[PDB]
């Protein structure tokens, strides 16, 4: 058994809260359950402190919404420069939540109202080797699609750190 | 598989040193990149054999790098600590580190050490051992030093001297107590202008700072003073690590009662506030928290901060980003804090003012038990003092919507200062409006009567409030 530390973060989390509470089969523990070989993963009065680098954590999920490309935008200016300073060597998944959403009648029309239309995945692997990502990977959080392939990555992420 | 070990670990027992270099290749591949195998070898057990050879052969330099790599992968297991702990390798890897100079040579020893270091217990054994000692002579020698090599010896050794301290046993043992001989020395990286030292010596200092008898014994000391001199010296730009450090070590050193008045006296509010420009949400998070600590039973400390427009009008937009939202909830606490503990009717006026009602109405509806009240309290002071100056707000707010959904619960005995601030929000003629709402066939029920004497009483006299006046 290997214990591995997944922190995520994003914009608005209702887009965020939905891709791990979807994996029941702030602190939360999945696992794989358990394929043979055993991987657990644990999520997110006197503080405790620590260095850089012995970070207790092992990989970040950096999560946009697919109907919003300015909360992927975002990502550059209000995420990256926090896990720049604070948590470096840490590797990165950015994930698109929602990708149900995408041509949809209701909501690439009222994208329409803000000179805009949804974010593609050229767009999204674009900021993906902007900010460094060790990968990408879209998910919808309502029709299930794609996301147990997002937790393989983030633990494939975590493991790739003789004689 | 099982069959193919059996035999690689019983050469294990060979005092023939070709025989081990040759079973190690063996074993060495597979099980490469098998966490199976690996575990397997754990139960075997191999790790306290393997404890025994690298202190028997440590004047070999072939098979002991061999071993090392061996440590490192094992580690990443979770079986391997509490087996690793049995053994002398706390011993037998500092006896190594004196022994080895060569900058490659100890940087495998330090990937070693920082994975098996993260068990509490091997703290301790390391410290017993005498690793803090060569590690502070380390960071000494190289801190002028510029060659890439050295600053990263430097980094690793101040760092894990950090880890070392997040052990309470072993931390226990370097506050010696603070000032002993080690937390000195490391007191003296906060002077220093050498930007890691500083870091290093704020988070050790922080982490030295986690029980209350040790906090006070700072304090007195003139650690707060030190740590303002850090701050100052990082304002207008920019290593946010280090102010992050520094603020989060105060935020600690605020705790204990004792020390809330004596570091507002040395002027940390101060000092703390020239970060409320800082856009970085971990700076801005052990900000609040710091001042949230200071302000706790001090009332005319939150009168000023109550009244200082420049902070409120910050919280109150930190409240409105709907990211983080971390900064989001201490903030709103914050806000909540400086009415509860001030009572003042000039900081309930600035509050309302910058517009903070809504937001405190809003964390009355929140899923942590302790913020509810918090926010209720303060809106109970809001509605004694200064009802007049709230009351447009509070209807915008739908406070009164939420205080009916509020009592009938599922619940919370929170309910009872609920009805307290429906009883004393009911005399305001633009107030409720809650006759208009229907709450007083929930108030008789609950009058009769939840399980709490408390939760009767009000409710029962603000069933004959409701019907009467
Ligand atoms: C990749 C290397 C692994 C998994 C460990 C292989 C080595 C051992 C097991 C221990 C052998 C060490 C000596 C004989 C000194």
Same mark, same amino acid.
């Given at each position: 058994?290997?214990?591995?530390?997944?922190?995520?973060?994003?914009?608005?989390?209702?887009?965020?809260?939905?891709?791990?509470?979807?994996?029941?089969?702030?602190?939360?523990?999945?696992?794989?359950?358990?394929?043979?070989?055993?991987?657990?993963?644990?999520?997110?009065?006197?503080?405790?402190?620590?260095?850089?680098?012995?970070?207790?954590?092992?990989?970040?999920?950096?999560?946009?919404?697919?109907?919003?490309?300015?909360?992927?935008?975002?990502?550059?200016?209000?995420?990256?420069?926090?896990?720049?300073?604070?948590?470096?060597?840490?590797?990165?998944?950015?994930?698109?939540?929602?990708?149900?959403?995408?041509?949809?009648?209701?909501?690439?029309?009222?994208?329409?109202?803000?000179?805009?239309?949804?974010?593609?995945?050229?767009?999204?692997?674009?900021?993906?080797?902007?900010?460094?990502?060790?990968?990408?990977?879209?998910?919808?959080?309502?029709?299930?699609?794609?996301?147990?392939?997002?937790?393989?990555?983030?633990?494939?992420?975590?493991?790739?750190?003789?004689? | 598989?099982?069959?193919?070990?059996?035999?690689?670990?019983?050469?294990?027992?060979?005092?023939?040193?070709?025989?081990?270099?040759?079973?190690?290749?063996?074993?060495?591949?597979?099980?490469?990149?098998?966490?199976?195998?690996?575990?397997?070898?754990?139960?075997?057990?191999?790790?306290?054999?393997?404890?025994?050879?690298?202190?028997?052969?440590?004047?070999?330099?072939?098979?002991?790098?061999?071993?090392?790599?061996?440590?490192?992968?094992?580690?990443?297991?979770?079986?391997?600590?509490?087996?690793?702990?049995?053994?002398?390798?706390?011993?037998?890897?500092?006896?190594?580190?004196?022994?080895?100079?060569?900058?490659?040579?100890?940087?495998?020893?330090?990937?070693?050490?920082?994975?098996?270091?993260?068990?509490?217990?091997?703290? %301790?054994?390391?410290?017993?051992?005498?690793?803090?000692?060569?590690?502070?002579?380390?960071?000494?020698?190289?801190?002028?030093?510029?060659?890439?090599?050295?600053?990263?010896?430097?980094?690793?050794?101040?760092?894990?001297?950090?880890?070392?301290?997040?052990?309470?046993?072993?931390?226990?043992?370097?506050?010696?107590?603070?000032?002993?001989?080690?937390?000195?020395?490391?007191?003296?990286?906060?002077?220093?202008?050498?930007?890691?030292?500083?870091?290093?010596?704020?988070?050790?200092?922080?982490?030295?700072?986690?029980?209350?008898?040790?906090?006070?014994?700072?304090?007195?000391?003139?650690?707060?003073? #030190?740590?303002?001199?850090?701050?100052?010296?990082?304002?207008?730009?920019?290593?946010?690590?280090?102010?992050?450090?520094?603020?989060?070590?105060?935020?600690?050193?605020?705790?204990?009662?004792?020390?809330?008045?004596?570091?507002?006296?040395?002027?940390?509010?101060?000092? *703390?506030?020239?970060?409320?420009?800082?856009?970085?949400?971990?700076?801005?998070? #052990?900000?609040?928290?710091?001042?949230?600590?200071?302000?706790?039973?001090?009332?005319?400390?939150?009168?000023?901060?109550?009244?200082?427009?420049?902070?409120?009008?910050?919280?109150?937009?930190?409240?409105?980003?709907?990211?983080?939202?971390?900064?989001?909830?201490?903030?709103?606490?914050?806000?909540?804090?400086?009415?509860?503990?001030?009572?003042?009717?000039?900081?309930?006026?600035?509050?309302?003012?910058?517009?903070?009602? #809504?937001?405190?109405?809003?964390?009355?509806?929140?899923?942590?038990?302790?913020?509810?009240?918090?926010?209720?309290?303060?809106?109970?002071?809001?509605?004694?003092?200064?009802?007049?100056?709230?009351?447009?707000?509070?209807?915008?707010? #739908?406070? *009164?919507?939420?205080?009916?959904?509020?009592?009938?619960?599922?619940?919370?005995?929170?309910?009872?200062?609920?009805?307290?601030? *429906?009883?004393?929000?009911?005399?305001?003629?633009?107030?409720?409006?809650?006759?208009?709402?229907?709450? %007083?066939?929930?108030?008789?029920?609950?009058?009769?009567?939840?399980?709490?004497?408390?939760?009767?009483?009000?409710?029962?006299?603000? %069933?004959?409030?409701?019907?009467?006046?």
């Amino acid at each position: 058994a290997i214990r591995k530390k997944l922190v995520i973060v994003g914009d608005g989390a209702c887009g965020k809260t939905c891709l791990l509470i979807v994996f029941s089969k702030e602190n939360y523990v999945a696992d794989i359950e358990v394929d043979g070989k055993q991987v657990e993963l644990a999520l997110w009065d006197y503080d405790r402190l620590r260095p850089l680098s012995y970070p207790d954590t092992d990989v970040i999920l950096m999560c946009f919404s697919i109907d919003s490309p300015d909360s992927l935008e975002n990502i550059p200016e209000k995420w990256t420069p926090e896990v720049k300073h604070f948590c470096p060597n840490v590797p990165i998944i950015l994930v698109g939540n929602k990708k149900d959403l995408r041509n949809d009648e209701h909501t690439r029309r009222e994208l329409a109202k803000m000179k805009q239309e949804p974010v593609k995945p050229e767009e999204g692997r674009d900021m993906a080797n902007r900010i460094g990502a060790f990968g990408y990977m879209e998910c919808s959080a309502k029709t299930k699609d794609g996301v147990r392939e997002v937790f393989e990555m983030a633990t494939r992420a975590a493991l790739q750190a003789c004689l | 598989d099982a069959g193919l070990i059996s035999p690689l670990v019983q050469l294990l027992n060979s005092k023939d040193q070709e025989v081990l270099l040759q079973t190690g290749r063996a074993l060495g591949n597979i099980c490469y990149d098998s966490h199976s195998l690996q575990a397997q070898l754990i139960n075997m057990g191999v790790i306290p054999t393997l404890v025994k050879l690298l202190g028997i052969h440590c004047q070999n330099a072939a098979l002991t790098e061999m071993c090392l790599v061996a440590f490192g992968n094992l580690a990443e297991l979770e079986s391997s600590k509490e087996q690793f702990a049995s053994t002398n390798i706390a011993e037998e890897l500092v006896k190594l580190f004196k022994k080895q100079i060569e900058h490659d040579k100890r940087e495998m020893i330090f990937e070693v050490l920082a994975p098996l270091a993260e068990n509490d217990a091997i703290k %301790l054994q390391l410290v017993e051992a005498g690793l803090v000692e060569c590690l502070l002579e380390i960071v000494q020698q190289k801190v002028d030093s510029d060659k890439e090599d050295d600053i990263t010896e430097l980094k690793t050794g101040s760092d894990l001297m950090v880890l070392l301290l997040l052990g309470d046993e072993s931390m226990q043992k370097l506050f010696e107590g603070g000032k002993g001989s080690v937390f000195q020395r490391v007191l003296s990286w906060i002077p220093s202008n050498n930007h890691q030292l500083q870091l290093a010596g704020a988070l050790a200092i922080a982490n030295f700072a986690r029980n209350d008898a040790n906090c006070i014994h700072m304090v007195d000391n003139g650690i707060v003073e #030190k740590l303002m001199d850090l701050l100052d010296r990082h304002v207008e730009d920019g290593n946010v690590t280090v102010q992050h450090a520094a603020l989060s070590a105060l935020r600690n050193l605020a705790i204990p009662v004792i020390n809330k008045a004596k570091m507002l006296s040395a002027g940390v509010t101060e000092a *703390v506030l020239k970060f409320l420009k800082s856009e970085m949400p971990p700076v801005q998070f #052990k900000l609040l928290g710091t001042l949230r600590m200071l302000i706790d039973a001090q009332a005319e400390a939150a009168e000023q901060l109550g009244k200082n427009v420049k902070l409120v009008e910050r919280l109150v937009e930190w409240c409105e980003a709907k990211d983080h939202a971390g900064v989001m909830g201490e903030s709103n606490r914050l806000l909540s804090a400086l009415i509860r503990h001030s009572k003042s009717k000039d900081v309930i006026k600035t509050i309302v003012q910058s517009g903070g009602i #809504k937001h405190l109405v809003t964390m009355a509806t929140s899923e942590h038990v302790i913020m509810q009240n918090e926010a209720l309290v303060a809106l109970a002071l809001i509605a004694a003092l200064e009802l007049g100056t709230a009351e447009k707000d509070l209807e915008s707010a #739908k406070l *009164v919507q939420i205080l009916h959904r509020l009592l009938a619960d599922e619940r919370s005995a929170p309910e009872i200062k609920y009805n307290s601030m *429906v009883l004393i929000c009911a005399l305001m003629g633009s107030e409720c409006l809650h006759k208009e709402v229907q709450d %007083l066939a929930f108030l008789d029920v609950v009058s009769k009567l939840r399980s709490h004497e408390n939760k009767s009483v009000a409710q029962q006299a603000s %069933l004959t409030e409701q019907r009467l006046t």
